[PDB]
Amino acid sequence: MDREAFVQTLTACRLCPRLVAWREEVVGRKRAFRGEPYWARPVPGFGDPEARILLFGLAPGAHGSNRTGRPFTGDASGAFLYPLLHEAGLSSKPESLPGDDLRLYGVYLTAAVRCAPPKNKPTPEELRACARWTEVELGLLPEVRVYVALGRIALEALLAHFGLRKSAHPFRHGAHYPLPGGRHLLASYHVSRQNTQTGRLTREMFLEVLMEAKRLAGL
DNA sequence: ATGTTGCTTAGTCC
DNA sequence: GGACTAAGGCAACA
Ligand code: SF4
Ligand SMILES: O=P([O-])(O)O
Ligand SMILES: O=P([O-])(O)O
């Protein structure tokens, strides 16, 4: 299917009952946003359909993409990620605001699961269900040369996608594995506030990942 | 009030 | 693999 068909069918998806409930249950639970409209639906990917670099996250944040409708938009993860994308020359401007004119250059963003999960922890079954959408979405990204897994969950999801074994591809920040057709699989700590504010992942470390992805992508 | 909640990793143990 | 949790720093939240 094409992208219009993808977005159309993805947004009406309700295969995971626990997530279909959670994505709406969190609406109004955060003080700063009570009374405001929430997307509270599956989140479609965002970015350059001709991207050579794919940044693969974990899932929607309850008050992040689940609220704004755009990956990494409206929370601490995006406040960290978007400025770095611009600093690396991969976007039109530093901030991402729903409904704005932000453009990504050579990069596309999406995640393993597309509906906000309790505790930011989808079950093995929810991962298997949404993996069908990963097949469709990545199927619509023909130019990707570098797949960047943001976190352990994201990597394991990509490994499953590429039919690779966990034992031969452990998760460690900076890890780089070869893929068929001269492509690449890179692993990075996730951009979560839990990682960036605690010091496990710094702005310097992540910009480095982005620069390396550009290098391996011929950008 | 100032204590709690909430935003992955890495290791334990079965 | 699966279930569990200490640790990490900060600040909205209550
Ligand atoms: S997580 Fe994915 S598969 Fe499950 S309901 Fe949401 S879009 Fe559908
Ligand atoms: O809502 P996310 O894309 O920041 O997880
Ligand atoms: O932000 P608070 O401290 O007024 O609740």
Side-chain angles (χ1 to χ4, degrees):
Chain A
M1 67 188 98
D2 60 4
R3 192 191 172 71
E4 183 176 298
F6 169 53
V7 173
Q8 219 282 171
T9 54
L10 166 62
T11 54
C13 185
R14 305 173 69 83
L15 296 176
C16 303
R18 186 182 70 132
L19 308 185
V20 168
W22 189 251
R23 72 192 195 197
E24 163 65 13
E25 206 284 325
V26 304
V27 178
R29 284 243 243 157
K30 179 164 166 52
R31 174 225 269 171
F33 310 122
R34 178 162 280 176
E36 301 181 2
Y38 269 62
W39 175 239
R41 279 186 281 301
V43 173
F46 179 81
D48 192 341
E50 287 282 284
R52 283 187 181 183
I53 301 177
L54 179 282
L55 264 25
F56 207 61
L58 166 34
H63 309 288
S65 61
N66 181 55
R67 179 175 62 83
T68 64
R70 182 190 293 178
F72 299 107
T73 303
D75 61 19
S77 289
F80 175 89
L81 173 72
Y82 282 109
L84 296 176
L85 281 179
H86 185 267
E87 294 185 12
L90 298 170
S91 70
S92 64
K93 63 188 179 72
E95 306 303 307
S96 175
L97 302 181
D100 72 1
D101 57 25
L102 174 65
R103 312 295 279 180
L104 300 192
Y105 308 130
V107 179
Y108 184 96
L109 315 167
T110 191
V113 162
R114 303 169 174 68
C115 286
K119 311 281 191 54
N120 303 305
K121 182 64 168 184
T123 64
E125 177 177 357
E126 301 171 329
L127 282 161
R128 288 198 293 279
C130 213
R132 71 186 61 191
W133 290 118
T134 293
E135 294 313 289
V136 176
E137 195 165 35
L138 300 199
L140 293 166
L141 300 172
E143 317 299 350
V144 182
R145 301 184 179 186
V146 180
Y147 297 77
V148 184
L150 300 177
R152 164 85 93 65
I153 300 305
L155 178 60
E156 284 174 33
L158 290 176
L159 289 179
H161 171 64
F162 292 114
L164 298 184
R165 296 287 168 53
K166 298 181 181 182
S167 69
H169 314 71
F171 168 85
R172 78 171 179 67
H173 182 78
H176 52 77
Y177 305 118
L179 294 175
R183 291 176 303 171
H184 312 282
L185 172 61
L186 297 175
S188 170
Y189 286 139
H190 186 262
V191 294
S192 169
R193 179 180 174 178
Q194 285 194 66
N195 286 164
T196 66
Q197 193 157 252
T198 50
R200 202 181 298 281
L201 177 64
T202 64
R203 283 195 295 172
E204 175 179 2
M205 292 168 75
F206 195 69
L207 181 53
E208 172 67 298
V209 171
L210 296 179
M211 294 309 273
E212 169 72 341
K214 284 183 67 181
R215 190 176 68 67
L216 294 181
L219 291 172

